[PDB]
Amino acid sequence: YTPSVSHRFIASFLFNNIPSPLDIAFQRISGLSRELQTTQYSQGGENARNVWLAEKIQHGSLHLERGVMTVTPLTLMFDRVLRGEKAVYADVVIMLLNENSVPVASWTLSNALPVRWSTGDFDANSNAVLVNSLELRYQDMRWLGVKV
Amino acid sequence: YTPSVSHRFIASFLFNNIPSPLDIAFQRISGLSRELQTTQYSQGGENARNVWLAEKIQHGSLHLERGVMTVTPLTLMFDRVLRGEKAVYADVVIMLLNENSVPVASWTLSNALPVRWSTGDFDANSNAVLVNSLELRYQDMRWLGVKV
Amino acid sequence: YTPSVSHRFIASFLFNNIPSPLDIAFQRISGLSRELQTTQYSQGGENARNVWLAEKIQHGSLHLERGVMTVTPLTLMFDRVLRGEKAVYADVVIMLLNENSVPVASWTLSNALPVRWSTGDFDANSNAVLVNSLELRYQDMRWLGVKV
Amino acid sequence: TTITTYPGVYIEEDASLSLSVSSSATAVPVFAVAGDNPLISGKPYIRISNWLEYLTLKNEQFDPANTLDISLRAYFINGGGYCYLVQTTDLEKQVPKLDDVTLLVAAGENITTAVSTLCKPGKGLFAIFDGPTTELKSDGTSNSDYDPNPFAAVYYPWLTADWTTTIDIPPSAAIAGVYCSVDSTRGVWKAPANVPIQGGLQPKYPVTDDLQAQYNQGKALNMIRTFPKSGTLVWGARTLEDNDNWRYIPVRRLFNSAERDIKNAMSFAVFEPNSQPTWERVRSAVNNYLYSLWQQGGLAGNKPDDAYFVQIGKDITMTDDDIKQGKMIIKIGMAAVRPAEFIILQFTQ
Amino acid sequence: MRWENKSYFAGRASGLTINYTLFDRDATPLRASATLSLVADESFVIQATEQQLKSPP
Amino acid sequence: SLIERGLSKLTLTAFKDREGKISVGSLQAMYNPDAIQLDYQTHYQQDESVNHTRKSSHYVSSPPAGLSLVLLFDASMPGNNIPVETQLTTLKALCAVDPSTHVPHFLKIKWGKMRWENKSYFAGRASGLTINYTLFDRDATPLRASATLSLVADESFVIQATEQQLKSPPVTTVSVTDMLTLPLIALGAGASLASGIDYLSLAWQNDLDNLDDFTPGQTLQAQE
Amino acid sequence: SLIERGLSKLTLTAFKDREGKISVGSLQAMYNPDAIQLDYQTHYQQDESVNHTRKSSHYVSSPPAGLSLVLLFDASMPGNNIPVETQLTTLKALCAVDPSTHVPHFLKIKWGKMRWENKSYFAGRASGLTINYTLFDRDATPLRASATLSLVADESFVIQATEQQLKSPP
Amino acid sequence: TQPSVTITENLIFPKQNDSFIGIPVFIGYTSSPVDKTAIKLHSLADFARSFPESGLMYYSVRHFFENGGQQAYVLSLGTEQQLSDFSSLITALQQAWLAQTIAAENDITLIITPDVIRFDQTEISDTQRDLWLQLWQSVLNLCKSRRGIMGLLDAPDDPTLAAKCLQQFSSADRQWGVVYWPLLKSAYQDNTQNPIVLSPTAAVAAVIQRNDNQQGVWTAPANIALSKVISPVRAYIEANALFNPDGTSLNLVRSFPGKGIRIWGCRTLENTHDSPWSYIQTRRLVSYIEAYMTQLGRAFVFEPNNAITWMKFKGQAHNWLRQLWLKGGLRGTQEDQAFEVLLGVDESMREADLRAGKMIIKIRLAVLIPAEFIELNLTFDTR
Amino acid sequence: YMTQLGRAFVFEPNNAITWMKFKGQAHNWLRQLWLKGGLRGTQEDQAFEVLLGVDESMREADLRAGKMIIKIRLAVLIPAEFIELNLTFDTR
Amino acid sequence: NYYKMPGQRQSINITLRKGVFPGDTKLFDWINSIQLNQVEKKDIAISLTNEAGTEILMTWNVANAFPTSFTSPSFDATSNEIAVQEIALTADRVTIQAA
Incomplete structure (x- = not known):
């Protein structure tokens, strides 16, 4: 029943079934959620x-944080999608690692579409690293692993 | 008149009238409430x-919190319900335990439907346990016990 | 002109003109308010x-809090009202007591209807007493006493 | 069934009753039983914990023609706890052997001699009698056979229910159940009257205000009456002595409970040195209990100095002769609260 | 209440709508609201008297 | 309730004829509607006169009463095994034109203790049926659909005739009490009659010897 | 399902004649509609009598059943290579007036196991078609468009006759 | 004998749980002998189950049920063979067990004796006048057996004798007695086809019971038409001496052209001008308020006699009275004018009263007055 | 049904937690059947009742023997076999 | 105007210091008996005493005290002291009685 820490993780992006080896380090990845929408119905005599x-x-949605590199x-x-070019899909595999760099839990996302890129403020009084904020929207989610 | 603490509790899920022995430990369970909806009416001469x-x-609704295990x-x-498969019901019994592991108070929920699963953020600067958040919607609630 | 403290009080519920002796101790009772609804009218030349x-x-409304007992x-x-049975009314008398357990100020409420029962969260990390929250909606309020 | 051989589920189709049991320490009754009863024959006493235990020991179905069966059913359905069964002839011999018994209940028997011997000051016992089985005499002489004992009370009339036959339930069995419920709910200082009688029990005879007016003073009888909206209630809380003290059952029974509780609180001081350090320890124990009792609401007074006092010491409560004899003497005085009994409505236009 | 100089409104129904909103388990209606609209239809005797009162012969 | 707490269900029954002597089929709603609306309208025409200053309006034919319902059909949640298409097919078939009479079926709506203006049933014919499909399976099987139903009242002729003569009997009977006069008796007896009655006609029908030839406790009759 | 979990697609077919003996063309929707509405109406006339106090109404001709859909066409997201103009051109041509019969084509709507009130198809003719273009490329190629379609039922005479004599046999 | 649908002449008698403010008891000789208990009847079928359908008692009970009655009690003094004369009936009504039986029953609120009509009334001697005075006192003593019971009384048939009885009646129980006059000629017929004469008190009791649920206990039960009544025995023109605005008076039962036979009075025997119990609805209203405060008061017996207990009673009593005032049951445009409740260690009691174990509540009420007379003064507009 | 529900608790620990799991589910199923018209009663406590405890239905001797005793009470409906009609005249 | 009144009384906190004796673990056994929120509460009395212990002068009474903290001795190899344990108690009331 031993729980898992949340500060060791990795993400991989596949472009046309080619993984990107330089896009695995992120400062923060938002949690992944699924919701079944429901509507409440009321009968006649059932009160x-x-x-x-x-x-x-x-x-x-998928949110990532990363410094300027x-x-x-x-x-x-x-850049290409937000430049006004043809939209392109990407596949993302998020993995939660243990002390031996073995993914105990992993979530895969199909057809992730880049939709937003923001950057931090240029502040002359700050002591901080300039951080990019990315958001993607995907079609499907599926989890694999021995833990979840 | 001695009141009861709120940090000792158990929850049991029954699937096809078979209890689940591995699903009894939770970090947090939200309170259960019932409300009688009313409409205010105003007469003519009654001011x-x-x-x-x-x-x-x-x-x-029923909210539960649990670590990744x-x-x-x-x-x-x-996972089956949120993967697009046929919806299925479950019966939940929430018990408040005393010093002898005897349920002084108990609430049973009929036909609970899983509707949401969310996970915590992957934060590289954090010192925390990855926690899953579950939400269910049930049809009826009934309480049994000696205290309430 | 000596003011009165707000941590010594008692409430009595009458069911069918029979007081309940076990329902006088509460952790908190919300303040009672009356409002005269008005609309502002403007004349032609009156600016x-x-x-x-x-x-x-x-x-x-009348809100109370009490521990599990x-x-x-x-x-x-x-429980009967919130189980779907026929609605029933109750009469409540709130009293503010002085050092001699004499009610200096008292408020009576006519035909109070139970409309909500809620309970606190089951927190595994908490050090607190499980508290029930009750709310009733009444028809009329009337205060008696030498202070108000 | 009762013979378990294979693992799995067994099916029974029975009709045995099932009731509930409370727990009150200040109401532990002893029921007088006729010697002809097979269950009690050959034993000094029998302790019954609940209806389930009684039915198991009886090994028979519930018989409404047995006076002892209906009395226990009436007693347990009214909220009574564990009790003791003692034959009537053995009351004066077996009751002192039992230490936790507080009530002496006449379950239809004649315990006049036992009450006159056991129920005395300092013994910590209270007796519950049975009223006459006939109609009340209007001359006011229907209570002539009862002794003016401040440790006893009488209840009239006998009760009947749906499960009744040529014999009627004695009122003592149902009343003793009321004592257990009131004590566990509102305390021993609250009057054991103006409370409903559980079950379908109904008085066999009707009593009006004029009838009760004769038997509410002197050797007073406590009535069980039915009112138009409140059902069947216990109407009366007076003992058999009409005095400024011990007039009401709550005052007499509160002192009985306090004396027992204080006696248990400072029983550690026996066979200790009879010196001042021991006396201070005993005073602390008694004062701690009395303050707690006042906090619960069992004593009258706005502050504890007005509700009780404790005195102990040399030349205050005891002399040289008392100390040399091994005697330790304590003075306790506590004020009890007396209930409102008569309500007067004054109407005018 | 006076309905334009008279203690009563004399007329005939021109529309009645009933909305049932709450039922019991045996379908017994527990709450219902009725919208009622009438059109005036007065008596001829009162009209004649009021006419000759304000315009006497 | 009085005995048990079963949930009464709304039922729809169809007949070929107005008197309901040839049943066609029936359908029980899987979910009771949470609101039922009844509508009554009646029209008047103002009276125009060249020599009268009276203000009055006379009655004109009132449209038939209307009833509106919304039913919900689901086949996705557990316990709902009847296909939606089967229930929707039955509902439409009951509201459709009969192949024999060439007119739509006559319907009856029954639901528990609910009374539809003094009767346990609403007798009428469908005047509108709208269906919205909102959820489908991967093989296009409909999983959720709601039907909006609206009928217009069409009652039986036999029931109408009996109720008419019950409240307006051809012959009425009265009882004579103390200090009653013949004009007073005719007013009470003639109240229920369609055309009333005069004191002379009432006397002639009862074969009275004179206008005061009756005693208290006697009974008198009045015809049309 | 019972064998596989393929996604059935709504189809629209056109014919010159009422009995569907001469096919004209077909179009498979690239996105299934998320809602379908069916409308039935029927009219009655109240009976007026000078000597009868009965209240009754008699049946007058009922308008044909109506059906309404909304289809979405996209050519911007990956995997959507069929041009929007081609799909819209095909859709209208199925709903247009036939040059040989001088009347609009007869249509059939089929989609999986969906039953359009006791038949696996809805038989009718288009009565309205609204097209909204909302996204264009730099050369004005339409990238997104939605078509609102509404039909009125027009069934075959042979099926009507057979069903009539089946329920009312001679 | 298979399961089937059949026609039967039997009757079912399910238990009834309804309650009413005013329940009468019929005291008189019945057809068959019974025990000393009071039988409760829910309909005319219950009477037939216990007694044969004949005699004066049967028709009085039938008259009660056909006038809107719903619940009644029957107390039998014996078999009909034991009726001898008027004085014997007075002795029978003066027995000792009658009061105990009536007091034991808490539902009885009205008392009716149908057997006063049987005996002859052809002599206007002072012996008869004394006999009638004894009967009224005997019935009023039965009403005193428990607070709240009111007796519906008969009057001598001869108007001169009845007027004599009203003037010479002397008692301290006037406020509990109500008298109606004259006898009624019912719609029922005997074996010789003659109409049966009945006392009006049977129909009045049904009216009182019905009027409480419809209009309220504070509404006068007068000006209400009776059912199954052919005609009063004597005309209204003979009762000009039976109404006294400043003395004892009867309640006339009278007929009108087109309105039927109606009750035309609401006064009690209380002859004092300034007494507050001159009207039946006023006396019954206060007994209705007393009954509730008795029920509320019972919940506070054997309770601690402190200020907290008093506030619990005072809050509820003030709550209930305000609800009754807002229903039109009390007179006053301000709340303090309609009622006032006093309960305290110095407002209503003293420290001696607390020591004795007493708890004293002071209640003041303002009641409404019926409209007995209407005078119209018509004057010309000086314009 | 209760046999099928009971089988899930065989070879399980005999403590108050296990009893509450059975009692909660059994009370859940019976109420659903009662609200379908399968049991007679206008109140829930009238239709059925389930008792399962160390003193409500068992004793310490039963626990030592390895038993678990559940008491169930039911109220059933009665069919309409005969219908009698009594027709009387309205006395008005 | 300016009004001042006493408020609510706070809880009483007590500390006791004792040496470590062979075979004695009574104080630790008390605090180790807490199950979930149940513990045996004891009354505590402290008395100023005659120099010989045979007479009481003043008594401090403490009602319903239960332990909240226990401190073990610190093991220092350079010290010349006695192992001392400390217990902390929470109570309700304190009263002073003069002998």
Whole structure:
């Protein structure tokens, strides 16, 4: 029942089934969530119970944080999409590592679309690293591993 | 009149009337509430009193918090529902334990439907345990015990 | 002109004109308020004054908090109403006591309807007493006593 | 079934009753039983913990034609705890052997002699009698056979229910259940009256205000009456002595409970040196208990100085002769709260 | 309440809408609201008297 | 309730004829509607006169009463095994044109103790049926759909005739009490009659010897 | 399902005649609609009588059933290579007036196991078609467009006759 | 004998749980002998189950049920063979077990004796006048057996004798007695086809019980039409001496052209001008308020006699009275005018009262007055 | 049903936690059947009742023997076999 | 105007210091008996005494005290002291009685 820490993790991006070896280090990755949307229904004479009806499933978005560094393939894809060029999908594999760099838990995302890139403020009174904030929207989620 | 502490509790999930022995430990369970919806009515000549009319009863949701651990039947049920498969129900019994592990208070929820699974953030600067957040919506609640 | 403290008080519930002796101790009782709803009217040539027209009177709600304890007649009434059974009324008398347990100020509420029962969260990291939260909606309020 | 051979599920189709049991330490009754009862024959006493234990020991189905069976059913359905069964002829011999017994309940028997011997000051016992089985005499002489004992009370009339036959339930069995419920709920200082009688029990005869007016003074009888909206209630809380002290059951029974609790609190001082350091330890124990009792609401007074006092010491409570004889003497005085009994409505236009 | 100089409103129903919003388990209606609208239809005797009162012969 | 707490279900029954003597089929709703609306309208025409200053309006044919419901059909949650398409097919078939009479079926709506304006049933015919499909499976099987139903009242002729003559009997009977006069008796007896009755006609029908030839406790009759 | 989990696609087919003996073309929707509405109406006339106090109404002709859909066409996301103009051109041509019969084509709507009230198809003719272009390329190529389609039922005479005599046999 | 649908002449008697403010008891000789207990009847079928359908008692009970009655009690003094004369009936009503049986039953609120009509009334001697005075006192003594019971009384058939009885009646129990006059000619017929004459008190009791649920206990039960009544025995023109605005008076039962036979009075026997119990609805209203405060007071017996207990009673009593005032049951445009409740260690009691174990509550009420007379003064507009 | 539910608790620890799990589910299923019209009663306590405890249904001797005793009470409906109609005249 | 009144009384906290004796673990056994929120509460009395121990002069009474902390001796190899344990108690009331 021993739980897992949340400060050792890795992410990999595959572009046309080629993994990117320079895009695995991130300061922060947001949590992944799935929600089954439901609507509550009320009957005529049933005034003490509730009925919930299932609907389509909503996936969350992927948020990453990273400092300013040399241009990598992930940056070039993000620049191209936000430049006004043809949209391109990417596949992302997020892995949670143990003390032996073995992924105990892993989540795979299909057809991730880059949709937002923001950068931190230029502040003359600050002592901080300039950090890029990226957001992607994907079509499907699937988890593999011995833990979850 | 001696009150009860809130840091000793157990939760049991029954799938097809078979209890799950590995799904009894949780970091947090949200409180259970029932509300009687009412509408205020105003008469013609009555300007000093209020009249409240009863309506249907609204049940709250069940929220659970747990760390990342080995795969258990509760996890497999949640994954199946959120993967787009047929919806399935579960029965949950929440018990408040005393110093002798005797449930002084207990609440049983009928036909609980998994509707959400979320995980914590992967933060490289944190010192924390990765925690899953689960939410369920049930049809009815009934309480049994000697204290409430 | 000596003011009164707000940490010594008592509340009594009457069911069918029978007081409940076990339902007098509460951790907190919310303040009782009355409001005269008004709408502002403006004349044609009157641009410097205001006119307020009176309307019906709105009463507030009654909120109580209490720890988990042995089942009492107040608990049974609340459970019956929130289980879908026929709605029932109760009369409440709130008293502010002085050093001799003499009620200097008292408020009576007519036809109070149980509308909400809630309980605190089960926290494994907490050091606190499990607390029930009850709310009732009544028809009329009337204060008696030498102080107010 | 009762013979378990294979692992799995067994099916029974029985009709045995099932009740609930409370726990009150200040109400531990002893039921007088006729000697002809097979269950009690050959034993000094029998302790019954619940209806389940009694049915197991009886090894028979519930018989409404047995006076002892209905009395225990009425007693347990009213919230009574564990009790003792003692034959009537053995009361004066076996009751002193039992240490936790507080109530002496006449379950339809004649315990006049036992009460006159056991229920005395300092013994910490209270007796519950049975009223006459006939109609109340309007001359006010239906209570002539009861001794003016401040440690006893009488209840009238006998009760019947759905499961009744030519024999009627004695009122003592149901009342003793009321004592257990009131003590565990509101304390021993609250009057064991104005409370509903559980089950379908109903008085066999109707008593009006005029009838009760004769038997509410002197050797007073406590009535069980039915009121239009409140059902069946216990109407009366007076002992058999009409005095400024011990007039009411709550005052007499509160002192009985306090004397027992204080006696247990400072029983550690026996076979200790009879010197001042021991006396201070005993005073601390007694004062600690009395303050706690006042906090619960069992004593009258706005501050503890108005509710109780404890005195112990040389030349205050004891002399040289008392000390040399091994005697330690303590003075305790506590004020009890007396209930409101008569409500008067004054109407005017 | 006076309905334009008279203690009563004389007329005939022109519309009635009933909305049922709450039911019991045996479908017994527990809450319902009725919207009622009438059109005036007065008596001929009162009209004649009021006419000859304000315009006497 | 009085005995048990079963949940009464709304039922729809169809017949070929107005009197309901040839059943067609039935359908029980899987979910009761949470709101039911009944509508009554009636029209009047103002009276225009060249010589009268009276203000009055006379009655004109009132449209039939209307009823509206919304039913929900689901086949996705556990315990809901009846396909949505089967229930929707049955519901539409009951509201459709009969192949024999060439007119739509006559319907009855029953639900527990609910009374639809003095009767345990609402008799009428479908005037509108809208269906919205909102959820489908991967093989396009409909999983959720809601049907909006609206009917117009169409009652039986036999029930209408009996109720008419019950409240307006062809012959009425009265009882004579103290200090009653013949004009007073005719007013009470003639109240229920369609055309009333006069004191002379009432006397002739009862074969009275004179206008005061009756005693208290006697009974009198009045015809049309 | 029972064998596999493939996604069925809604299809639209056109014919020159009512019995569907001459096919014209077909179009498979690239995105299934998320909602479908079916509308049925029927009219009654109240009976007026000078000597009868009965209240009754008699049936007047009912308008044909209506169906409404919304289809989405996209040519910007990856994997969507069929041009939007081609799909829209095909869709209208199926709903347009036939040059030989001088009347609009007869349509059939089929989609998986969906039953359009006791039949696996909806038979009718287009009564309305609204197209909204919302995204264009730099050369004005339409990238996104939505078509709102509404039909009215027009069934075959042979099926109507057979069903009539099946339920009311001679 | 297979399961089937069949027609039966039997009757079912399910238990009834309804309650009413005013329940009468019929005291008189019945057809068959019974025990000393009071039988409760929920309909005319219950009477037939216990007694044969004949005699004066049967028709009085039938008249009660056909006038809107719902619940009644029957107390039998013996078999009909034991009726001898008027004085014997007075002795029978003066027995000792009658008061105990009535007091034991808490539902009885009204008392009716249908057997006063049987005996002859052809002599206007002072012996008869004394006999009637004894009967009224005997019934009023039964009402004193428990607070809140009111007796519906008969009057001598001869108006001159009845007027004599009203003037010479002397008692301290006037406020509990109500008298109606004259006898009624019911719609039922005997074996010789003659109409059966009944006392009006049977129909009045049904009216009182019905009126409480419809209009309220504070509404006068007068000006209400009776059912199954052919005609009063004597015309209204003979009762000009039976109404005294400043003395004892009857309640006339009278007929109108087009309105039927109606009750035309609401006064009790209370002859004092300034006494507050001159009207039946006023006396019954206060007994209705007393009954509730008795029920509320019972919950505080054997309770601690402190200020907290008093506030619990005072809060609820003030709550209930305000609700009744807002329903039109009390007179006053301000809340303090309608009622006032006093309960305290110095407002209503003293320290001696607490020592004795007493708890004294002071209640003041303002009641409404019926409209007995309407005078119209018509004057010309000086314009 | 209770046989199938009971089988899940064989060879399980005999403590208050196990009893509450059975009691919660059994009370859950019976109420669902009662609300479907399968049991007679206007109140929930009238339709059924489940007792399972160390003193409600068992004793310490039963626990030592390895037993677990559940007491269940039910109220069932009665069919309508005969219908009798009594027709009387309205006395008005 | 300016009004001042006493408020609510705070809880009483007590510390006791004792040496470590062979075979004695009574104080630790008390604090180690806490299960979840249940513990045996004891009354505590401290008395100023006659120089010979046979007479009491003043008594401090403490009601319903239960332990909240226990401090073991610190093991120092350069010290010349006696092992001393400390216990901390929380109570409700304190009263002073003059002998």
